[PDB]
Symmetry: C4
Subunit: 388 residues, 4 copies
Amino acid sequence: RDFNNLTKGLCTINSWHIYGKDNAVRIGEDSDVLVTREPYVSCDPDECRFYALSQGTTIRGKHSNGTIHDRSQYRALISWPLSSPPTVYNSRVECIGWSSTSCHDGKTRMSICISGPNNNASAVIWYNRRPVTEINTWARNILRTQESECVCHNGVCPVVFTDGSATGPAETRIYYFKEGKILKWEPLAGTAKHIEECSCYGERAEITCTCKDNWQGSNRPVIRIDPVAMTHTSQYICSPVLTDNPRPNDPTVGKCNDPYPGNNNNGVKGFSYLDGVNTWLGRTISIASRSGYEMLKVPNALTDDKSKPTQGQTIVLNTDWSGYSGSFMDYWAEGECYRACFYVELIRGRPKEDKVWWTSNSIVSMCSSTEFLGQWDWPDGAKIEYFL
Amino acid sequence: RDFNNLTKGLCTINSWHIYGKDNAVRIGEDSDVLVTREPYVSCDPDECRFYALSQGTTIRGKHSNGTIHDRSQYRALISWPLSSPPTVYNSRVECIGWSSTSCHDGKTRMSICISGPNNNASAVIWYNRRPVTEINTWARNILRTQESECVCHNGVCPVVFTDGSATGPAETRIYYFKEGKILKWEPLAGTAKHIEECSCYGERAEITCTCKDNWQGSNRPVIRIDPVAMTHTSQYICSPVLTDNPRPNDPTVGKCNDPYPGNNNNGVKGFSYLDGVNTWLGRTISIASRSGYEMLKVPNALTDDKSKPTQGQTIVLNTDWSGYSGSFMDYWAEGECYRACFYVELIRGRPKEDKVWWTSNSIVSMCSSTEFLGQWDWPDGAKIEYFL
Amino acid sequence: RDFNNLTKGLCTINSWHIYGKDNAVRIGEDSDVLVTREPYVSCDPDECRFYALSQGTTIRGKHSNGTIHDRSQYRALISWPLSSPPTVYNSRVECIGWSSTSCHDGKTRMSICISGPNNNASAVIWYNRRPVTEINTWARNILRTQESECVCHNGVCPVVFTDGSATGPAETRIYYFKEGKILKWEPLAGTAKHIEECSCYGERAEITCTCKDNWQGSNRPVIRIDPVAMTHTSQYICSPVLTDNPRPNDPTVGKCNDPYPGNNNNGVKGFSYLDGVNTWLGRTISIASRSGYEMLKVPNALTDDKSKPTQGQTIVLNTDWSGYSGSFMDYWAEGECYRACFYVELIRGRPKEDKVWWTSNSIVSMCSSTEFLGQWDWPDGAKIEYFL
Amino acid sequence: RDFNNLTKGLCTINSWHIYGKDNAVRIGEDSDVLVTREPYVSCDPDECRFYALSQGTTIRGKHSNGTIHDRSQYRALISWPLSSPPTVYNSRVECIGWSSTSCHDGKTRMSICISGPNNNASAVIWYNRRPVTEINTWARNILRTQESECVCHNGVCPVVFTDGSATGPAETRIYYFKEGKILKWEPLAGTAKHIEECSCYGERAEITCTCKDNWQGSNRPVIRIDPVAMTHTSQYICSPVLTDNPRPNDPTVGKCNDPYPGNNNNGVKGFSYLDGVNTWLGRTISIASRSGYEMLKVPNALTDDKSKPTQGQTIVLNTDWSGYSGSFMDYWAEGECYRACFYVELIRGRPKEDKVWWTSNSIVSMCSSTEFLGQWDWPDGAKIEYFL
Ligand SMILES: *[C@@H]1O[C@H](CO)[C@@H](O[C@@H]2O[C@H](CO)[C@@H](O[C@@H]3O[C@H](CO[C@H]4O[C@H](CO)[C@@H](O)[C@H](O)[C@@H]4O)[C@@H](O)[C@H](O[C@H]4O[C@H](CO)[C@@H](O)[C@H](O)[C@@H]4O[C@H]4O[C@H](CO)[C@@H](O)[C@H](O)[C@@H]4O[C@H]4O[C@H](CO)[C@@H](O)[C@H](O)[C@@H]4O)[C@@H]3O)[C@H](O)[C@H]2NC(C)=O)[C@H](O)[C@H]1NC(C)=O
Ligand SMILES: *[C@@H]1O[C@H](CO)[C@@H](O[C@@H]2O[C@H](CO)[C@@H](O[C@@H]3O[C@H](CO[C@H]4O[C@H](CO)[C@@H](O)[C@H](O)[C@@H]4O)[C@@H](O)[C@H](O[C@H]4O[C@H](CO)[C@@H](O)[C@H](O)[C@@H]4O[C@H]4O[C@H](CO)[C@@H](O)[C@H](O)[C@@H]4O[C@H]4O[C@H](CO)[C@@H](O)[C@H](O)[C@@H]4O)[C@@H]3O)[C@H](O)[C@H]2NC(C)=O)[C@H](O)[C@H]1NC(C)=O
Ligand SMILES: *[C@@H]1O[C@H](CO)[C@@H](O[C@@H]2O[C@H](CO)[C@@H](O[C@@H]3O[C@H](CO[C@H]4O[C@H](CO)[C@@H](O)[C@H](O)[C@@H]4O)[C@@H](O)[C@H](O[C@H]4O[C@H](CO)[C@@H](O)[C@H](O)[C@@H]4O[C@H]4O[C@H](CO)[C@@H](O)[C@H](O)[C@@H]4O[C@H]4O[C@H](CO)[C@@H](O)[C@H](O)[C@@H]4O)[C@@H]3O)[C@H](O)[C@H]2NC(C)=O)[C@H](O)[C@H]1NC(C)=O
Ligand SMILES: *[C@@H]1O[C@H](CO)[C@@H](O[C@@H]2O[C@H](CO)[C@@H](O[C@@H]3O[C@H](CO[C@H]4O[C@H](CO)[C@@H](O)[C@H](O)[C@@H]4O)[C@@H](O)[C@H](O[C@H]4O[C@H](CO)[C@@H](O)[C@H](O)[C@@H]4O[C@H]4O[C@H](CO)[C@@H](O)[C@H](O)[C@@H]4O[C@H]4O[C@H](CO)[C@@H](O)[C@H](O)[C@@H]4O)[C@@H]3O)[C@H](O)[C@H]2NC(C)=O)[C@H](O)[C@H]1NC(C)=O
Ligand SMILES: *[C@@H]1O[C@H](CO)[C@@H](O[C@@H]2O[C@H](CO)[C@@H](O)[C@H](O)[C@H]2NC(C)=O)[C@H](O)[C@H]1NC(C)=O
Ligand SMILES: *[C@@H]1O[C@H](CO)[C@@H](O[C@@H]2O[C@H](CO)[C@@H](O)[C@H](O)[C@H]2NC(C)=O)[C@H](O)[C@H]1NC(C)=O
Ligand SMILES: *[C@@H]1O[C@H](CO)[C@@H](O[C@@H]2O[C@H](CO)[C@@H](O)[C@H](O)[C@H]2NC(C)=O)[C@H](O)[C@H]1NC(C)=O
Ligand SMILES: *[C@@H]1O[C@H](CO)[C@@H](O[C@@H]2O[C@H](CO)[C@@H](O)[C@H](O)[C@H]2NC(C)=O)[C@H](O)[C@H]1NC(C)=O
Ligand SMILES: CCC(CC)O[C@@H]1C=C(C(=O)O)C[C@H](N)[C@H]1NC(C)=O
Ligand SMILES: CCC(CC)O[C@@H]1C=C(C(=O)O)C[C@H](N)[C@H]1NC(C)=O
Ligand SMILES: [Ca+2]
Ligand SMILES: [Ca+2]
Ligand SMILES: [Ca+2]
Ligand SMILES: [Ca+2]
Ligand SMILES: [Ca+2]
């Protein structure tokens, strides 16, 4: 109809309720489920769907061997109905590639897939299910993007890309698209020293992205974008409650403009909702691996370097595998506020579970509630032994 | 379009004709059918569909082992086309959880799923396929609801919940929702001593619910709701024709305001159509187990404590497994009356058939006919031996 | 939109072109295809689909054992996209039962399924995907109907039913429905001595049905219905070119008002287009079994007792299995005439191929061409050996 | 809406970006994927889909044995969602046959399937999913057509057919259809000596077809059609950059009006975009077999007999199997020009990989970019060893 405008502010997050779960690995043990990773969720005005990067093979299929690898010519961004698994029969391919993002602007959807060899990748921007624009690698070192939904405001949908090293400075760019065409692009500015896999959400005409500093920081870099001025700023979450993984133990004071040191060249895509006292941080329970997942209310985390938790909710027990996590919201819901949501990628198989030769995952996702709801843990649920 | 209003009375039930049957267990022996239980049927203005709680695994899949269990994080309310089986590929997830209800108000559908650990469950009310309201457990003991469709009148859709003991008094509440929001809730009143899994239907602006007294009664408790005044009353079916299971043998006189004694802490979800002489009761044939199923016309059963059958129809032979049963009607059909319908859950596997490690079911459903039709029996149809 | 009216006459049939073929048995050897029999084809204003009676099990599934049997509680009328196979995932159940008919009246579709034990069957007439009317058995001996599409004119859709013996006189009735309701019914009149499984088509406000005299006739009985007057007549095809199976060898003169003798208590559903010189008869090649299939142009077959073929087309070689055949046409196609079409049921398995324990079939269907097209043979295509 | 008119010229092709890839053979190793060959891509105004000729069996099914054969009664033209594989469950049959073409005219789609024995084939032209016209073989020797999309202009959709020898002169005809009816047909004229499997595209009211001279030429014959005058001309691509396979090594000067000699009675369906300096040729890398695939920019290839490459892009490595290739474009995309696209059939199995008894393929497809994008190679991806 008309382009959506981020006119509402976030609803108050007093707890998280269960939104969607596909039990893909459980079900896929005996049905045609595609091997995936890098999932996310994204809504259209009339439907919300699960998204991920397929590996171009079923889990039980012999080609599942080797799916720990990230970039092959057999991957593709696919979307499928909320809480169903990604099956060969219900999965819709949005584009071909090994890194992606996607978002609906109110009128139609924009999907971006990057493919190529490490030194010659290219992104192709699809709009209304057609290819419209192409961007060639600018640093010749794995051009890559968000791995979760982008956000639009009045037709403008900003997307964060990174090209170059994952263990040193790189060339991050913020592209502002409208109807799949490039209106403008900036180089990253601000104090964030390295940016990868940004998780974004929007409210009151501002887009917030919580990304990952793969190079040095265990605290998360944050990019705030003005989609009207088409400008942005960058910093780190000030809070001592560190949210990357692996990471050191939490200090009593964090860092606002430098990566918090202790762990180099590693990390995981993650997210956060930064909204004054209505601030909630997601993070793995383990400081060593992608294990467990919890939400922590840390009032003023972004700007208060001594902020510590005031409430919390466990999402996945530390005795269960987690992985990537990101943000999304249904901008077309009823009501006066946007209900914060997020998903957690539950990785199964390699490298942690090497008795099988594949790597895949299932999805669990929650949204906020103004009630103070009881909590449950949500694991993948599959028994690896069955796959042997 | 406009909210549906219960303006018609029931059609005269002279017999029951076959409406839908999915043969899920037969077919699932060699195809991707999800393991389920707690099924029901429910109509939208343009389609009627089968509903149930999936166990997040196929019947032939190795994760089918253990599905006798009721509440896990892998369950979800799913709906699929009438008379098809619940397959991994045609099943639509309405919400995540282990207890549910769902009903269309004429404009759109409301679905409610409860999930959680026993002491910290919560219900989330979805409307127009989006989460709108959340209700936290109030007694911290398995918050649970109908397991069959709710009914709406002018936008108001009442739902009966129970939280607390299953073998002593509990806290039952009747919530009145409109567009997924709570308009009001009452505590249970009347003479019903325990309420669980209500089967409801509506006619001439009144909603009737035949539930289950798990605690003491072998006769069924009944809740009649006025969706305009948003008030209700409760009693038991007066009739000596007892309809719970297990149950004692039928007496010659029943009880109108107390549970009929003889069996404690057990029972099964069931239903009835209470309409003066046009009154029909469903019940298992066996007084000891979920075996067989029959419909009995017991004129004035609700209010006549000596009422006995005047006609009847066998639905499932006593030599076949049955289970839950509930009511639904197509409120959007042509004609001057609402045609009473019902479904019977045909449970296969555990605990009665323990040579297999799973528990599932198929569905058979009938609707009334003003003709006096010949009768047939409708069993699940699967040979367990094939699954060994 | 508006009710369809049979305003056109048949197109000239100079040959038959391939219309649809599903290769169901071939494909089903390694995919979730339902076991069926009694197929047919039928069009809606915007789509033409394949129809059949499922056996409630896949071909490879263990429950396929025993599907030679005709009437069980696991059967159902299903429809699926043209030329696709009937799979567990793409099949839509129209109604439950073991004998059926179905036709679109221009506004919506009417489907009829009969179910029951032999002495207590009942038909339920669905209209606009809802049950509207029910008819109880009147002779208590396998109430049964067409097994191919019915035809409508201005909302009136006549259907031929038979109840009673299959090897002696029976009670055949012609019901005239409008919006699933009964307007009127007649007993069979005319010279046809026994009627079963009528194949019908309509043109210029007249409905022609070529049926089967299971009792005594090897020539086919024909019922011509006036859907406005709601009256009909009956006779046999006069032609010496006999079209039932089994049957005696062709004589030089046939019979117009009595069954042509030689074979008792047996036969197969078949059809014909009776249109003066534009008359074409379908029949198995073998006079002993359901083997092969050919179309023969026999000018004035209905009324000329010495009529013999003037042209012909082989559809299935005598070295391949055939079975039932029936008529249908797309009444919503462009053009000035109705293009005659038909399907042939290609039966595989029992009783002819008993190395397997199942019985199923695939479908091949043709429509007429005003061209004189080259001919090909169209067998099922499956190798039974693969199923052993 | 209204008939589409080829009003735009081609966009400048500076490189090729990835458009679609289905990884059908990889995925089909463990899921219900149909065995195919002769694929292509074609767009409707609101969707672009993959197309191919099914073999009426899954790859893993036992009937896959023997699918190296071209013409059987079990083949059918099927279409399925872009980048999904052709599965038994998501494939839509357009028509029955072993040679086909299909194109949308802006209002609806025309599909043509030819079936028959070698000496008695016939084409049936479907429009708006209904059979409209039939054409009988005129030379009684494998009537055959494009195997890729046709193109329409103001309702007129020309199609090139060939009937007769594949190793000597044959009878090629250009039919001009409108709404599935024949407006006119011409015999082939011009200097092309043999025509088979034309790949066509349209721009600025002219339709260009790059075909195959199976008889003598290693350079490709080209047919340019005026869909308004309904006339055409024919010649060969003048360029020394030879594009058929097998073929001799490239000379320094090609032939404009005679086949370039060196290889007889063999070849492969291929294509090209002939647009002055914006001219790009596709071809296998190997001069001996269907191995590898590359795009070469050969300015003025059609008319310059000494034209050689000025830029190029590898699509498939010479160490991977290729096969057929053809053209298509989305005539309903936004923008001021038509973006050239093409697909490559990646053949797996027989005859090159004979350890398996089947022959199938997957599809990879690209479209042009005005950017100068990095290149990647796109192989089928399946390991034959897994199928043993
Ligand atoms: C039914 O449902 C309800 C609803 O969920 C249940 O009630 C909830 O219960 C939760 C668990 O108790 C509770 O969550 C906790 O909230 C704490 C904050 O509240 C308390 O402090 C505030 C502030 O003073 C008070 O106002 C309030 O009254 C409370 O006293 C959080 O602090 C908790 O998180 C911390 O603990 C967990 C382990 O429990 C850690 O996993 C987590 O990371 C936090 O602790 C680490 O991080 C801090 C900050 O740096 C460190 O100081 C601390 O030492 C930990 O650091 C180590 O561990 C981390 C992680 O591994 C590592 O990185 C680091 O290096 C160190 O190794 C927790 O979130 C809910 O808020 C509460 N909800 C509600 C509405 O009440 C109820 O129990 C259920 N009922 C039943 C019967 O079960
Ligand atoms: C073709 O189709 C038609 C259509 O269906 C067939 O005709 C139908 O046939 C049915 C079976 O006969 C018949 O159903 C019965 O109806 C009885 C009522 O009608 C009779 O009584 C009235 C009232 O006086 C008369 O007007 C009428 O003319 C009849 O005489 C019911 O009473 C029957 O139900 C009871 O019996 C069945 C077993 O048959 C039990 O399963 C059932 O629960 C009922 O009996 C128990 O309950 C009562 C009440 O408490 C007890 O008194 C009794 O002792 C039983 O109690 C024990 O069993 C229960 C259950 O296990 C247990 O809980 C308890 O503790 C005790 O252990 C039955 O419903 C249809 O009405 C009739 N329909 C029509 C239209 O005619 C026709 O036969 C078919 N044709 C062929 C050729 O097959
Ligand atoms: C390419 O394609 C074209 C297009 O299809 C091919 O040409 C077609 O070829 C067909 C086969 O030749 C041909 O079909 C036959 O047509 C005959 C009628 O035409 C002839 O007679 C007329 C009338 O005088 C002439 O005008 C005309 O010029 C011809 O001379 C039919 O009579 C044929 O049917 C009979 O034979 C077949 C076997 O071929 C039987 O299966 C069939 O049942 C018919 O015969 C039985 O029935 C009759 C009637 O009672 C009996 O008299 C006879 O003895 C048979 O009876 C026995 O068998 C039956 C069946 O088993 C049994 O019940 C009975 O008891 C007895 O045992 C046949 O239909 C097409 O018309 C022709 N089409 C066109 C447009 O030309 C062309 O060949 C192909 N090209 C190549 C290179 O292959
Ligand atoms: C990242 O991405 C970019 C973008 O793709 C990469 O850059 C691209 O690199 C490509 C490979 O180098 C390059 O493709 C080549 O382009 C050549 C034309 O450009 C050159 O010549 C022009 C004209 O003078 C100059 O202007 C220009 O500056 C260049 O110097 C083509 O000529 C190439 O094709 C020929 O070679 C390939 C093998 O490389 C053959 O497969 C192909 O068939 C061509 O050669 C055969 O055919 C010719 C013509 O008849 C014969 O003369 C020749 O001998 C060959 O003949 C034999 O082989 C054929 C085929 O088997 C057989 O039939 C015959 O009988 C003989 O046996 C090639 O297409 C891109 O244009 C370039 N793109 C861009 C934008 O720059 C970049 O490298 C990537 N980065 C990294 C780090 O990898
Ligand atoms: C989002 O904001 C823009 C205004 O910036 C709205 O756009 C106006 O929409 C109306 C109706 O389409 C037009 O007449 C105006 O010209 C539009 N645009 C501009 C850019 O001036 C848009 O409608 C808003 N979206 C919604 C859903 O309200
Ligand atoms: C059900 O009853 C309500 C009246 O209570 C009907 O609601 C009225 O509908 C018309 C048309 O939408 C409005 O103008 C009235 O204001 C509506 N509501 C009320 C609450 O006054 C409703 O249309 C009835 N539903 C149907 C299907 O007839
Ligand atoms: C089929 O015939 C009937 C006439 O018998 C047509 O019915 C008339 O349709 C118009 C428009 O709907 C009405 O105003 C008339 O009253 C209708 N009916 C009768 C029974 O008089 C019908 O439209 C015809 N169908 C088509 C497709 O032309
Ligand atoms: C393609 O060209 C034809 C003109 O040749 C356009 O056809 C005209 O369309 C308008 C609106 O439908 C009619 O009033 C004219 O009579 C049409 N046709 C002719 C043949 O004169 C057609 O609309 C064009 N297509 C598009 C998409 O613009
Ligand atoms: C390119 C380096 C980057 C950071 C190490 O790699 C990612 C890490 C991943 C991970 O840590 O799990 C998975 C992503 N699929 C991958 N991105 C790409 C494009 O391969
Ligand atoms: C009829 C001869 C023609 C050229 C040799 O054959 C084609 C070659 C093919 C090929 O070279 O792979 C495949 C096509 N499926 C086939 N066409 C038909 C109708 O069978
Ligand atoms: Ca399987
Ligand atoms: Ca880090
Ligand atoms: Ca009880
Ligand atoms: Ca007979
Ligand atoms: Ca050649």
